Amino acid sequence: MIKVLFFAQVRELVGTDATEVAADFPTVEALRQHMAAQSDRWALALEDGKLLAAVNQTLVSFDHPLTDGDEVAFFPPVTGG
Amino acid sequence: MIKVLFFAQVRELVGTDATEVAADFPTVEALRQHMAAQSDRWALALEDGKLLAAVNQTLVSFDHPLTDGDEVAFFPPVTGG
Amino acid sequence: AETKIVVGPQPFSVGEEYPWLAERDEDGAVVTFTGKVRVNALTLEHYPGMTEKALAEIVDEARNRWPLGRVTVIHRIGELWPGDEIVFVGVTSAHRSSAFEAGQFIMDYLKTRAPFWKREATPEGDRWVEARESDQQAAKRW
Amino acid sequence: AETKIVVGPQPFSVGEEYPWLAERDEDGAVVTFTGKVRVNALTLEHYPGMTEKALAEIVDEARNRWPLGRVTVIHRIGELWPGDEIVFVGVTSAHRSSAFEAGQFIMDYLKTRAPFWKREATPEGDRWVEARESDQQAAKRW
Ligand SMILES: [Cl-]
Ligand SMILES: [Cl-]
Ligand SMILES: [Cl-]
Ligand SMILES: [Cl-]
Ligand SMILES: [Cl-]
Ligand SMILES: [Cl-]
Ligand SMILES: [Cl-]
Ligand SMILES: [Cl-]
Numbered sequence: 001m002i003k004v005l006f007f008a009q010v011r012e013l014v015g016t017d018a019t020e021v022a023a024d025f026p027t028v029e030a031l032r033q034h035m036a037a038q039s040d041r042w043a044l045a046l047e048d049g050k051l052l053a054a055v056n057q058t059l060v061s062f063d064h065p066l067t068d069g070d071e072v073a074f075f076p077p078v079t080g081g
Numbered sequence: 082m083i084k085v086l087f088f089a090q091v092r093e094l095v096g097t098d099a100t101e102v103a104a105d106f107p108t109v110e111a112l113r114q115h116m117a118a119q120s121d122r123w124a125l126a127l128e129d130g131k132l133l134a135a136v137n138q139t140l141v142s143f144d145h146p147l148t149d150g151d152e153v154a155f156f157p158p159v160t161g162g
Numbered sequence: 163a164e165t166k167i168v169v170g171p172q173p174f175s176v177g178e179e180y181p182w183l184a185e186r187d188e189d190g191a192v193v194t195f196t197g198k199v200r201v202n203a204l205t206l207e208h209y210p211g212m213t214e215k216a217l218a219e220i221v222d223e224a225r226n227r228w229p230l231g232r233v234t235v236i237h238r239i240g241e242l243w244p245g246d247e248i249v250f251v252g253v254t255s256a257h258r259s260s261a262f263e264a265g266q267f268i269m270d271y272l273k274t275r276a277p278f279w280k281r282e283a284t285p286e287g288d289r290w291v292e293a294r295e296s297d298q299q300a301a302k303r304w
Numbered sequence: 305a306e307t308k309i310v311v312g313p314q315p316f317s318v319g320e321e322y323p324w325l326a327e328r329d330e331d332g333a334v335v336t337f338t339g340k341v342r343v344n345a346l347t348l349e350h351y352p353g354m355t356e357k358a359l360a361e362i363v364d365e366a367r368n369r370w371p372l373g374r375v376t377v378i379h380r381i382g383e384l385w386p387g388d389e390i391v392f393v394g395v396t397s398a399h400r401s402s403a404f405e406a407g408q409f410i411m412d413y414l415k416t417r418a419p420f421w422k423r424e425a426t427p428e429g430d431r432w433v434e435a436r437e438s439d440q441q442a443a444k445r446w
Contacts (some may be wrong), residue, residue, distance in 0.1 A: 161420025
């Protein structure tokens with residue numbers, strides 16, 4: 001699969017902490033577009049320009065390619081420190 | 082009087098830790114020129130461009146005016162911290 | 163050139179972290195930073211598989227930019243209150259200029275790249291703390 | 305807005321200085337700097353009537369430039385050896401940017417304005433440590 005995690009506002013709005021998707025997407029951006037088209041809440045959760053992405057616990061651009069077995073996470077701008 | 086203190090290289094070269102002078106000098110620079118003309122060692126001690134001055138424990142420019150009862154100190158660039 | 167990275171609820175004490183940070187003679191300049199919670203409780207949600215790791219990638223980058231000795235980074239999670247220490251950053255180097263700079267760098271990247279989200283327990287309910295444009299401008303200057 | 309300034313041979317311990325520095329809640333950002341001796345003994349000669357006072361004038365200036373909470377500055381004198389802590393600077397503020405900057409400022413001004421002179425006890429005799437052009441360029445950028 002591809003495994004997808006969500007955090008903060010995004011996790012609240014998509015309404016699940018994690019989900020799996022068909023490893024059928026060339027890039028993070030492709031996966032994002034796909035998941036956003038699932039419903040109005042997902043599109044609202046996953047369409048912000050400031051939305052961040054990570055692949056196997058590293059921050060990546062949205063062009064970053066996917067591979068069967070990856071961990072993908074979407075989340076809003078961070079507020080730590 | 083005017084009281085004059087010296088530190089580090091300058092104290093070594095002038096060959097005393099302190100001395101008093103006739104409060105008769107309009108400025109630090111005037112006092113400096115005076116003391117330098119006392120001998121070759123004093124002139125060597127007190128002529129460097131980088132020589133620092135202080136009046137009553139504050140760092141001052143050489144134009145700073147003098148007054149009967151002041152404490153003047155000459156010393157080289159500092160090397161603390 | 164060892165690095166200590168810890169993410170957890172436990173309080174830290176700068177007095178306990180410090181002697182390890184400052185112990186090597188060749189590391190003659192030691193900079194620390196401590197950041198506290200800015201009356202309402204705060205909770206730091208985080209992404210567990212990624213927080214220690216992002217913090218380690220940030221120090222890796224700092225170490226390619228500046229010649230650094232020992233470095234420590236501690237960030238807490240859970241419920242904290244104003245005045246509690248949330249983050250510790252400790253950096254050593256031969257000169258003050260690289261230690262202050264790496265310190266500053268580590269915080270600016272931590273605040274825009276490390277997966278933590280603050281929420282505030284107000285009288286009206288939980289409230290996500292807003293991310294600052296000034297932290298984005300701080301990060302991009304590096 | 306209290307300030308602690310100490311000049312003396314006594315060692316200090318960052319663990320003892322720190323809790324006083326970091327204690328006020330409104331001071332949410334705490335930066336420390338420690339500078340150590342960079343094998344030969346060093347002696348710091350100083351101008352006693354002026355060292356605490358110049359250090360206080362430097363913090364006064366820092367306080368007009370940045371909004372600072374509690375500040376501590378400790379500088380030692382006497383004979384020290386590589387690895388001994390010579391100077392402590394501790395600065396607090398509401399934001400990290402002013403705390404790091406004041407920290408940096410306080411050190412750059414300390415190193416070009418505070419009356420201390422290092423000498424080194426080499427096999428060939430005492431040797432005055434040379435003052436750096438880079439400290440002069442650091443001070444003038446402020
Ligand atoms: Cl689309
Ligand atoms: Cl003359
Ligand atoms: Cl906070
Ligand atoms: Cl330094
Ligand atoms: Cl600096
Ligand atoms: Cl030294
Ligand atoms: Cl801050
Ligand atoms: Cl900063």
